[PDB]
Amino acid sequence: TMTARSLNLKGQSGELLSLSTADKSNDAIGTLDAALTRISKQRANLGAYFNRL
Amino acid sequence: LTEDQKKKKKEIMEQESLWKNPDFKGYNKTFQELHQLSKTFANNQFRLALSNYQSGVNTIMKNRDWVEQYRKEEAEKKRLDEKWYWQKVDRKAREERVVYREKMKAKQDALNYFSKAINHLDEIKNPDLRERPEFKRLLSDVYRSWIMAEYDLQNLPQTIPILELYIEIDDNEKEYPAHKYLASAYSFEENMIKKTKGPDDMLFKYRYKKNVHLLRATELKYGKDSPEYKHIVNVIN
Amino acid sequence: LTEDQKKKKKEIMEQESLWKNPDFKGYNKTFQELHQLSKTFANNQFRLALSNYQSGVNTIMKNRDWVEQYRKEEAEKKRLDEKWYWQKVDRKAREERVVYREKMKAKQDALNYFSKAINHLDEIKNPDLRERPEFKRLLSDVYRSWIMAEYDLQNLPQTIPILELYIEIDDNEKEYPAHKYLASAYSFEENMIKKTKGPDDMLFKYRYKKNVHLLRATELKYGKDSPEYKHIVNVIN
């Protein structure tokens, strides 16, 4: 894992001091479900593995 | 008309067609020719560059289809709480928001593909191959679509380095639309300096470059020492 | 083409074939010729050297069969605890490790056999026999397989003394692959000095030897004062 584990959206429409913006709002928050899901389930296997040990 | 005036009229119309907003007949023609050129070229990195360019254009074409469908679906909704003028204008502006944000994402995906097409062309290191008409045709098509994708979303400052790279390739400098877009994008940047009260060196830099490409576009379409050429020169002098 | 350019094209293809990764048709051809040469030579130590060389190549060939079978058996397993990306990448990487460790052992057994083939050729003391085409053919085949066994496992520094001994034998110095491998192995060693921040004398030694064999490989395949020869010389000068 690294920030590129999910769609790593930065910034938002309008004037910024960066050179990046977020994508279609619908996916942006939807992505955070993916981010949370992807990491939690990775912990899930580690959890399960601990039980195996 | 003279043979040069007839030739010029024909060429300007072909150049305006060349920069035509994408559609299905132009897509078909473009990719049929590019694939025949790829088979002639027989270069795996050119093949890959074309595969990515085509994926980028497909992103653009699929988006154009989405925009019509989205606007259609909204038009067909019954809106019961839309009885006041501000309510109708409200919902219109929010439709434009979603369309603009989706077009912005389609542009970003299309430019990631165009960037990959360029990165693959960069891997053709042999100078005898980089000078091939096949190489220059594809590279010109990638830059042209890239310029247009940004232009449509009013990202005019971003079009300048790509237009400049474009005109350096195989007599593209003699294309009237290329100089028209450069002049317009430079004009935008000049106006940005005037609105944001930026430095004079940049005001004059952008004004100068606007006038160079304004005059060159004029020369190319109407001819040197034409009433139109003489006019633009007299305004600048 | 000239008679020399036609001859050169033919020879480079034969040399590329000579250094082809081993397979069953090449194995059969190689050992049928070596056994006929052994019968002509009528030297018990050459016979023994060939028996060991063949045992070494057989180790390599039997390993190649093992690697296909092993990967096949793994591919055919149902993997229930492989539902995350890193689980698949894990099990793939460990498969590759087991294959690499088994290939490493096969290389070690094959080189023990090649070493024995050399130790038996060392026992041919008569200079009139050591100069026999039969002697030089087998010795070249042992060094070539030895170089390739190490090359495949990225043991490039180890290939240098064997490539150097190889090129000293019966015009092997005129072989394009021999100089390509030397140049690549020297390049690796140069990079090792740059990465480990080693002494300058070794940096330049390895860089020099890379360039000598790079240029010589170029000369051999394309010809002296060819666009390609001139290019490499101009980069070095």
- Residue A43 contacts by C-beta under 8 Å, 6 or more apart in sequence? none
| Cα nearest neighbour of A23 on chain B | B105
- Residue C15 contacts by C-beta under 8 Å, 6 or more apart in sequence? C175, C176, C177
Q: Give A37→chain C minimum CA distance, Å.
A: 12
Is C28 within 8 Å of chain A by CB?
A: no
Is the dihedral angle over the CA atoms B89, B91, B93, B99 positive or is it negative? negative
Rounding to the nearest 10 degrees, give the CA dihedral for residues C58, C59, C61, C67: 160
Tell me which DSSP letter residue A13 carries. S
Q: Give A45→chain C minimum CA distance, Å.
A: 9
| CA–CA distance, A51 with B67 (Å, rounded to integer) | 51
Total residue length of chain C: 237
HSE on the CB side for B162, CA within 13 Å?
A: 24
With H, G, I as helix, E, B as strand and everything else as coil, classify residue A16: coil
What Rg do the C-alpha atoms of chain A give, in angstroms?
15
Are B117 and B138 in contact by the 8 Å Cβ rule? The answer is: yes
Q: Give B102→chain A minimum CA distance, Å.
A: 6
Is A23 within 8 Å of chain B by CB?
A: yes
Q: Flag if A24 and B108 touch (Cβ within 8 Å).
A: no
Tell me which DSSP letter residue A20 carries. -
Are B142 and B34 in contact by the 8 Å Cβ rule? The answer is: no
Return the partners of chain C (3 or more C-beta pairs < 8 Å). A
- Using a CB-CB cut-off of 8 Å, the residues of chain A touching C86 are 42
| Cα nearest neighbour of A37 on chain C | C84
Q: Flag if A25 and B101 touch (Cβ within 8 Å).
A: yes
Q: What 3 state SS string does chain C have?
A: CCHHHHHHHHHHHHHHHHCCCCCHHHHHHHHHHHHHHHHHHCCHHHHHHHHHHHHHHHHHHHHHHHHHHHHHHHHCCCCCCCCCHHHHHHHHHHHHHHHHHHHHHHHHHHHHHHHHHHHHHHCCCCHHHHCCHHHHHHHHHHHHHHHHHHHHCCCCHHHHHHHHHHHCCCCHHHCHHHHHHHHHHHHHHHHHHHHHCCCHHHHHHHHHHHHHHHHHHHHHHHCCCCHHHHHHHHHHC
| CA–CA distance, B124 with B117 (Å, rounded to integer) | 12
Distance set, CA C91 to CA A46, A48, C87, C137 (Å): 16, 18, 6, 44
Q: Report how far Cα B175 is from the mean position of its chain's Cα atoms.
A: 13
What kind and span of H or E run contains A38?
helix A25-52
Return the partners of chain B (3 or more C-beta pairs < 8 Å). A
| CA–CA distance, C69 with C61 (Å, rounded to integer) | 13
The experimental method is cryo-EM
- Residue C227 contacts by C-beta under 8 Å, 6 or more apart in sequence? none
- Using a CB-CB cut-off of 8 Å, the residues of chain A touching B101 are 13, 23-25
Interface test with A, best of C79, C80, C81 (most A CBs within 10 A): C81
Is C85 within 8 Å of chain A by CB?
A: no
What kind and span of H or E run contains A25?
helix A25-52
Interface test with A, best of C80, C82, C84, C90 (most A CBs within 10 A): C84
Q: Which two tokens stand for residue C12?
A: 């480079």
Q: Give A22→chain B minimum CA distance, Å.
A: 9
| CA–CA distance, B180 with B12 (Å, rounded to integer) | 12
DSSP string for residues in chain B: --HHHHHHHHHHHHHHHHTPPP-HHHHHHHHHHHHHHHHHH--HHHHHHHHHHHHHHHHHHHHHHHHHHHHHHHHTS--SS--SHHHHHHHHHHHHHHHHHHHHHHHHHHHHHHHHHHHHHHT---HHHHTSHHHHHHHHHHHHHHHHHHHHTT--GGGHHHHHHHHTSTTGGG-HHHHHHHHHHHHHHHHHHHHHT--HHHHHHHHHHHHHHHHHHHHHHH-TTSHHHHHHHHHH-
Residue of C231, C100, C233, C217 whose CA lies nearest to C163: C217
- Residue B59 contacts by C-beta under 8 Å, 6 or more apart in sequence? B106, B109, B110, B113
| CA–CA distance, C174 with A53 (Å, rounded to integer) | 61
